[PDB]
RNA sequence: CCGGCCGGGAACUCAAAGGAGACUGCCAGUGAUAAACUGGAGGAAGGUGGGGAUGACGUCAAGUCAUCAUGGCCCUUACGACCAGGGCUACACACGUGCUACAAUGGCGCAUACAAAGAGAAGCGACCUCGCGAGAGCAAGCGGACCUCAUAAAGUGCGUCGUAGUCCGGAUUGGAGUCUGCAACUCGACUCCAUGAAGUCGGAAUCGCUAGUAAUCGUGGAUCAGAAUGCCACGGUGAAUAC
RNA sequence: AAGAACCUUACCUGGUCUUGACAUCCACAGAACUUUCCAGAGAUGGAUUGGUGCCUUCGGGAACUGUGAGACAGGUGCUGC
């Protein structure tokens, strides 16, 4: 119940609680429990301590939870210090893949602020 | 076998054209399986009509492609030059095929 | 409308008991237009209902549809400065349709999980009035007992 | 639309026709994929130092009888407006008001 | 993005214009307009203007920006903010 | 309101196609506008003549185009000279084979685009346009269409604010599709701008 | 010997042939009760049948195309109808009086120019 | 070789032509013995059956000189023309019109039924092989009731989730990629992996709809190299209400 | 607006052209056409391999191109009062 060393919950399905792990979705987690030899449908609390460290070793494979996301925050900060486009609106928090910023965009700039 | 593909877009002249198709094909003894009507192709178009702006203002034009099939089994050598000669009315296109 | 309706729609009685009252049922409840979906849940309730109380699945639906049924509800009139309650006794029909609605209403508001389980378990209230829809005809009735004095109209 | 517009839609059809040819070539040895590296390279610098106007992608639609860019109809080759008046004078074989 | 079939995208004048001055050394910075020219790996050093409608805005290639479109270092648009 | 074309209405009812070549969609665009440039360079070359209509058909790869006339001896000149020139001229537009052929019209004075025509020509004259539409309804009315409208539209007489201004007499139901309105328009380019001139002519039912 | 109907309802076609036998309804070369799942579909499929009381006296050999499970529903309907008027004459009236006779001629209203469906306008709005 | 597959049949469904029918025709009552109305039979349809096209004189000196034509004025080493880059895609904000949601009448997984209408020749692209998928390779067939687009989805059967900001919900963003196109940075669509936001039914106010309509589910087309939640059509399921 | 990456595009920054991209008509020259090299962001300018014909009053016209003055051409410039 604790993999990658993070606190996945036991009374989930496998599928449904290995996604917990930051960097794990459901196509991923049924990989993980695909090679890992475990049923799909199998709560956490009602495995094998030899399938769970099994299970270990599978997430192990795939870049998560820190690893994962100081990956990402290099990713994001060479944009920022190049000063590409990306760099730029990056850096102002604004849509970064094309999308329209007359109106919405509400996700990057945040809820309203009046004038 | 005999193909003719009668296509028009004007569904009383296209009757004459395969009415004389027919006239011609048995006067020159050979026996025909028709006329067969096809399926008409309705292209249908939308355009709005005012120069400017006006968008629920709107004609809606319609092209009707009637089509006629003639089949001619045992197709006798007069048979064959006289369809080939008869030279159909203008507004008829004939596709002849074997 | 200004003119007049024709003869009312007809209605094709539900196949498993043959009650246009009940096939109304299922039309209310209907959403978005999947009746088999209204009649699946509807059917499921009735079976249930029926397997917790005793009565005949139209029987109890019949009881539990009476015990919300109205007798008189209030529409609204103009004279001036105010607006009048007026009390006006209901026909039938819309007796059974606004027993309807009402019984679909507190089902679709209550708290439960499946909508079989929800309509049945309020059916069940409304078998001894409890539910929110014998609520609201309490309310509907004591409305129009309040402004009965606007009745003689 | 302009003169100068219409000028430029008959250019670019004649120099699309003109180098069709080559164009064809050096896109069939770019998305040939057993063609060797070197042969892709340069087919892209030949494609590049083509003209752009050659593209057929350039071209633009327009109503032959005003010029007009938008409402096209390719069936007709003319704008909403022109399809409107040809059609009711009765310059459209066939074409009548539909209702169905 | 370009598909890896094609290879990458880079305009013949500039690859010309670079090949020379990588070859020839230093030199004045490449003014040039093929925004959409992809840096290669022997860019670096080179300080290139790249056009972005009005100005040439000059661009130090360093390593970090190779695989990507020149354009990109050269913004086209003005933008300080409403009622500062 | 505006109103819907009588022609075009009436096309596939009580009217006949003023084009009947079937092609499909690759030469239908070529061919509309091949027909175009026809009709437009026989306009302009037989303005004077009073060319009523101009059908257009093509049979193989052959272009015939009817000319309804008002005029035939004078489009056709000495014993063919000028039907032999412009036949030339359209076969070389169209790039096909022609063969053109003349059509009698009787009484230009029941044509819809006639009268238009005559009422512009005498606009450009600078006659009144009240007289001249006056005119016109007298002289359909008497060669017997059981109906007419005449609308002229625009700047009249010099005004600095167009008006419009109809005159009618008898039956013109344009509501009915199987009564045959034979209608048409011109336009007069004037010193003082465009005038409009639009013709409705019943002439009877099915 | 056969007697043949044919129903149609939105846009499906049932042709019907109906011959006395062991009450067998045979839809599309399958059982009524795997080529329906609605059971409303089923009583609509049988509501003739039961309502002149000939429902095992009958054999049903039936063809429907186009539409949907209503729609090929009511073709079945009207083609049983039909069938049993080739059939007999002197259950009509209590056909007719039941109201399955009559073909339902409603169709999907055709969608316009200037409204989102049929008759939905799109939203308006003073301002 | 259980596939109309082949021989065949012309019945049937369909395809397209031509006809018939519905007219207040008949009956009853009401009604100024009139128009007509209230019903009834018959009939597929009963009262202009449903829908569409059809927009009268004229009103707003309503809109368009940027489709076009056009009087007058104006520019003409230019206010015309050519070219590459950029912008029309900018964002403290405000409004309109929509799409997806807020879940269990649901989500996900597996199997499976039922459509109409349209398109297509530097076009639609089978089958087969490869790719997890966008798609790639070879490549038939078809200007077509033949071939392709193109397995409809909602629905039904079983399991699962068990009311939780959740297997709801999909924004946003990172990485890797496919296709079109000379070229995808500004500024494309799509795919895979990952991230998983706001949202728990929305104040005053306000809109559509009386039937196969609303609601809901998918499909096609025009424009188009690529680029629909828009627009225009098509069918599937399918109500309540009108005193 | 039935669909702005370039085009569209009418706008902006620069590089360029002015009887002009598109029309007639005047004269002269030259068949056109095709391919190739340089410079330039491209426009555009240098060249040039090949080509040098189609009818013929065989001498010239028909086309297609450049040049040379124009009469003009061009305007999505204003005015829908
Ligand atoms: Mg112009
Ligand atoms: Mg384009
Ligand atoms: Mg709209
Ligand atoms: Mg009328
Ligand atoms: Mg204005
Ligand atoms: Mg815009
Ligand atoms: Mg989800
Ligand atoms: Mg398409
Ligand atoms: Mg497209
Ligand atoms: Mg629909
Ligand atoms: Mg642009
Ligand atoms: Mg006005």
Sequence with gaps: ?115 | RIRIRLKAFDHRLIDQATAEIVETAKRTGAQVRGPIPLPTRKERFTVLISPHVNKDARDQYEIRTHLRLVDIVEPTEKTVDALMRLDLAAGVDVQISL | PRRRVIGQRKILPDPKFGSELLAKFVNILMVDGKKSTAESIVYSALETLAQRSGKSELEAFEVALENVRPTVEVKSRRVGGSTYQVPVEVRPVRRNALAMRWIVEAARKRGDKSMALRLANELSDAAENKGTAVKKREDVHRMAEANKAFAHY | AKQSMKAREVKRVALADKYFAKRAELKAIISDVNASDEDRWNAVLKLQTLPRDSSPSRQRNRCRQTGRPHGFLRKFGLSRIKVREAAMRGEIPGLKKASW | PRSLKKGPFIDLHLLKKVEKAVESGDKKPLRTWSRRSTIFPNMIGLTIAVHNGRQHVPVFVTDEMVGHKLGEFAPTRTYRGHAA | GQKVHPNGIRLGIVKPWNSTWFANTKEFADNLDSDFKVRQYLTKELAKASVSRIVIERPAKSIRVTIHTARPGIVIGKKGEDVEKLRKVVADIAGVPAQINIAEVRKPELDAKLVADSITSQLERRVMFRRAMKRAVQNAMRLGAKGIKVEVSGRLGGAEIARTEWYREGRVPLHTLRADIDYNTSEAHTTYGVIGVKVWIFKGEI | NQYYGTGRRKSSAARVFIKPGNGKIVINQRSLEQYFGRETARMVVRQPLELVDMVEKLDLYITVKGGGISGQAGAIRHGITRALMEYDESLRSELRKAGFVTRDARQVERKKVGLRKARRRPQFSKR
Excluded: W
Aim: net charge positive; with cysteine; proline share 3%.
């Design chain 1, 1 to 115: 119940a604790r993999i990658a060393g993070i606190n996945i919950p036991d009374h989930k399905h496998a599928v449904i609680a290995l996604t917990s792990i930051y960097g794990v979705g459901k196509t991923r987690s049924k990989a993980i429990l695909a090679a890992a030899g475990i049923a799909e449908d199998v709560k956490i609390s009602e495995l094998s301590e030899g399938q769970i460290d099994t299970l270990r070793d599978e997430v192990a494979k795939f870049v998560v939870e820190g690893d994962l996301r100081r990956e990402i925050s290099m990713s994001i900060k060479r944009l920022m210090d190049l000063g590409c486009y990306r760099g730029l609106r990056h850096r102002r928090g604004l849509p970064v893949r094309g999308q329209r910023t007359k109106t919405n965009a509400r996700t990057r700039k945040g809820p309203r602020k009046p004038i």
